[PDB]
Amino acid sequence: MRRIAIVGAGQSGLQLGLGLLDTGYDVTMITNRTADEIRQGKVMSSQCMFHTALQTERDLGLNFWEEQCPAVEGIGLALVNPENGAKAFEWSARLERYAQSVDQRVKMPYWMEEFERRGGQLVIQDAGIEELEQLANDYELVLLAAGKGEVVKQFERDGARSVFDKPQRALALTYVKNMKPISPYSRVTFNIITEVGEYFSFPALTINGPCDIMVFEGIPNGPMDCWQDVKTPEQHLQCSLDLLKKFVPWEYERCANVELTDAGGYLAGRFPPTVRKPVLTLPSGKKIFGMADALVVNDPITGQGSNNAAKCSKIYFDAILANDNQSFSEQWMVQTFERYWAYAEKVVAWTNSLLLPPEPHVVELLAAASQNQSIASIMANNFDDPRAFAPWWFDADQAQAFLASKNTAKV
Numbered sequence: 001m002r003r004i005a006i007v008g009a010g011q012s013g014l015q016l017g018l019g020l021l022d023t024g025y026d027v028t029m030i031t032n033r034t035a036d037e038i039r040q041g042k043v044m045s046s047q048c049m050f051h052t053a054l055q056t057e058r059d060l061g062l063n064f065w066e067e068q069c070p071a072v073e074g075i076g077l078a079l080v081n082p083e084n085g086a087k088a089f090e091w092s093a094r095l096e097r098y099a100q101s102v103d104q105r106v107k108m109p110y111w112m113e114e115f116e117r118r119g120g121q122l123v124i125q126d127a128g129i130e131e132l133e134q135l136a137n138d139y140e141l142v143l144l145a146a147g148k149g150e151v152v153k154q155f156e157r158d159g160a161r162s163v164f165d166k167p168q169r170a171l172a173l174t175y176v177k178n179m180k181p182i183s184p185y186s187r188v189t190f191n192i193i194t195e196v197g198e199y200f201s202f203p204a205l206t207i208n209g210p211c212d213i214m215v216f217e218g219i220p221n222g223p224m225d226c227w228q229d230v231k232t233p234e235q236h237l238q239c240s241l242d243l244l245k246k247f248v249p250w251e252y253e254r255c256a257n258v259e260l261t262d263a264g265g266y267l268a269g270r271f272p273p274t275v276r277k278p279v280l281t282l283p284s285g286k287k288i289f290g291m292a293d294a295l296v297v298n299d300p301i302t303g304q305g306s307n308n309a310a311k312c313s314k315i316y317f318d319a320i321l322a323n324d325n326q327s328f329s330e331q332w333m334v335q336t337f338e339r340y341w342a343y344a345e346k347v348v349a350w351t352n353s354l355l356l357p358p359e360p361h362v363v364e365l366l367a368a369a370s371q372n373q374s375i376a377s378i379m380a381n382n383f384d385d386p387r388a389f390a391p392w393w394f395d396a397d398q399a400q401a402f403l404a405s406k407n408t409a410k411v
């Protein structure tokens with residue numbers, strides 16, 4: 001086997017490193033935060049991973065919290081008019097196989113300790129250009145999986161693949177205890193508030209047990225872009241509740257007794273969606289290979305970043321083993337990233353489309369699910385593989401042919 005270095009101890013980097021270790025490769029992992037620092041820090045994601053991604057962890061024996069984590073059993077969607085609070089339509093459908101959200105503050109520190117137990121070499125360091133030169137001399141392949149850390153900006157922006165150059169949503173997360181559950185099955189409670197933003201919630205597992213995550217995505221400078229003024233945890237929770245009272249009262253009804261899970265259970269921020277070129281050439285001329293968010297970053301849940309990172313780790317693992325004792329040349333890196341892009345391209349197109357006003361046929365497609373449960377089930381289960389939204393999500397004639405087929409079948 002081979003000697004691999006990975007920079008960044010996140011979803012894709014640890015999944016790939018752990019599977020490589022179990023298959024006899026030597027892996028060194030450089031990362032800027034210790035496992036205890038991650039445990040003691042702020043939340044970093046709402047990390048809802050769907051069945052196929054969860055299964056990539058299960059196959060590696062890395063689903064350590066499946067027994068402890070509440071299941072996310074379906075998808076709900078409502079389109080809301082902020083003026084009158086009226087729902088243009090609403091629907092929900094079970095997922096065929098459940099999703100789970102295990103707080104990265106739980107998963108990554110345990111995975112990091114598991115990495116060291118499996119014989120991995122863990123180095124705590126802030127990798128800059130000079131650090132990457134050292135790894136490039138010492139290892140056969142250096143993977144940069146640093147997520148949104150700005151060493152990632154050293155990869156060239158792909159202007160042909162990046163539709164946006166500025167943040168499309170103001171993000172906020174709130175982890176709470178005591179939210180009322182939804183009978184008879186849990187679901188992601190997607191609320192599209194027209195020209196305002198999106199709210200959704202789902203159960204999850206965090207550092208002190210099961211909880212629910214509130215996710216706000218505000219169109220910038222709009223009514224939901226109010227987090228720049230929030231600082232204290234109490235102001236954050238109060239802003240979360242005030243937004244639900246104003247725009248989503250049925251979700252607010254679930255929140256009479258909520259409290260933050262812990263002092264780090266909240267986050268606010270924003271970042272542009274971006275696609276980058278996969279190979280970084282160092283001043284020495286040695287090559288660094290990007291992976292997951294370092295190269296393809298999107299906006300939460302529909303951006304699917306944890307799901308993408310898990311699936312990306314499996315594609316890179318398969319490509320590494322398939323390369324045997326050949327060099328990890330720039331050609332092999334580009335070919336491997338294009339295998340990932342062959343998956344992610346359509347996922348990116350789908351999530352990008354939801355950041356903008358919906359095409360009239362997409363409103364028609366989403367609205368049809370409220371009258372045809374078989375369409376709602378297709379929509380919900382396509383979260384497990386958003387490639388299946390193509391072609392009808394993107395082509396109005398394909399959309400009408402899809403609807404014409406579903407409703408003639410309904411008879």
Ligand SMILES: Cc1cc2nc3c(=O)[nH]c(=O)nc-3n(C[C@H](O)[C@H](O)[C@H](O)COP(=O)(O)OP(=O)(O)OC[C@H]3O[C@@H](n4cnc5c(N)ncnc54)[C@H](O)[C@@H]3O)c2cc1C
Pocket residue numbers: 007008009010011012013030031032033044045046047048049125126127128145146147148149150151171172173267291292293294300301303304305306307308309
């Ligand atoms: C608010 C928010 C909500 C989200 N909700 C969801 C969701 O619901 N479902 C879903 O599927 N995805 C979601 N995502 C996306 C998902 O969390 C990320 O896309 C995913 O974690 C990316 O995995 P990764 O391996 O690429 O990098 P990461 O998991 O982010 O980890 C990168 C690692 O690199 C380290 N690092 C950074 N810089 C350096 C450096 N210079 N040197 C060494 N190490 C460094 C970091 O400390 C970290 O350990 C969300 C993201 C955000 C911001």
